[PDB]
Design a protein around this ligand. Structure first.
Ligand code: ATP
Length: 263
């Protein structure tokens, strides 16, 4: 937790890697070591001690913090593989089993955070980055929305780590069909959809998806936080731990739905 006079004495700021709600992420070179990093530039408009304890293969490591008069600079492990949806769209062949492998990694990382007492609360397909352009690259959670936001939260009821399990279910849903489980033109009706947790595995998009996958999703996307699968429980579900995920090429439809619905 140092301070920088000119942050630029220490980092060479090159290109914007991406942009958040009210912060940008920048590719930089550590001038001291020549190591490439990703720097999160947060305007100034106890948890950082915890953020350094986070060390997991599927979580973007925070490597340092420096502060200037105007901003906070979070020096992050650089990830070079691009966003999750982009790879899926650009990918030639895509299966339920690829979806399951990604979900496994997210569950693994999320449970590890829950054991540190960290609740993500903003798990989104955007937060999910490939580690390299390697075809076999692992995925990683970058961060430390309607749709993705669990019913409890939107009901302004008491919420636990179970909120993150909801988000994971929403992501799994999108990963298998390319569109969000909740959508309406009127925000009011959308929120009511989310609050009632009423969604469908609607045909034709879901015809070729396994029942085990549907079972898996039903259990994460469960309105009652006390009924909802936890990370540990989702990990041991057959679709994740066994051999139920199918091998059919679902790329075309999912890819087209993603283009219709995101970026
Ligand atoms: N470590 C990283 N390496 C490479 N690119 C990153 C890294 N972290 C973030 N990015 C890029 O920045 C984008 C924005 O992510 P974040 O900055 O994670 O968005 P956010 O969830 O809106 O956070 P915030 O609300 O604090 O701005 C990502 O989608 C990705 O393209």
């Amino acid at each position: 937790w140092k301070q920088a006079e000119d942050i630029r004495d220490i980092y060479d700021f090159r290109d914007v890697l991406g942009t958040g709600a009210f912060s940008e992420v920048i590719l930089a070179e550590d001038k001291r070591t020549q190591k490439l990093v990703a720097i999160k530039c947060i305007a100034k408009e106890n948890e950082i001690a915890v953020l350094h304890k986070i060390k997991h293969p599927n979580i973007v490591a925070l490597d340092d913090i420096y502060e200037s008069g105007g901003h906070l600079y979070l020096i992050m492990q650089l990830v070079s593989g691009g966003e999750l949806f982009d790879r899926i769209v650009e990918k030639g062949f895509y299966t339920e089993r690829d979806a399951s492998r990604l979900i496994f990694q997210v569950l693994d990382a999320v449970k590890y955070l829950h054991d540190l007492g960290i609740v993500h609360r903003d798990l989104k397909p955007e937060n999910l980055l490939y580690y390299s352009l390697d075809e076999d690259s692992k995925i990683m959670i970058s961060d430390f929305t309607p749709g993705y936001v669990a019913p409890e939260v939107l009901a302004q009821k008491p919420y636990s780590k179970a909120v993150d399990c909801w988000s994971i279910g929403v992501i799994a849903y999108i990963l298998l069909c390319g569109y969000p489980p909740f959508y309406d033109e009127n925000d009011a009706k959308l929120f009511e959809q989310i609050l009632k947790a009423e969604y469908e595995f609607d045909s034709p998009y879901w015809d070729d998806i396994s029942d085990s996958a549907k079972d898996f999703i039903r259990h994460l996307m469960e309105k009652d936080p006390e009924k909802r699968f936890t990370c540990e429980q989702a990990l041991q579900h057959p679709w994740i731990a066994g051999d139920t995920a199918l091998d059919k090429n679902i790329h075309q439809s999912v890819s087209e739905q993603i283009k219709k619905n995101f970026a």
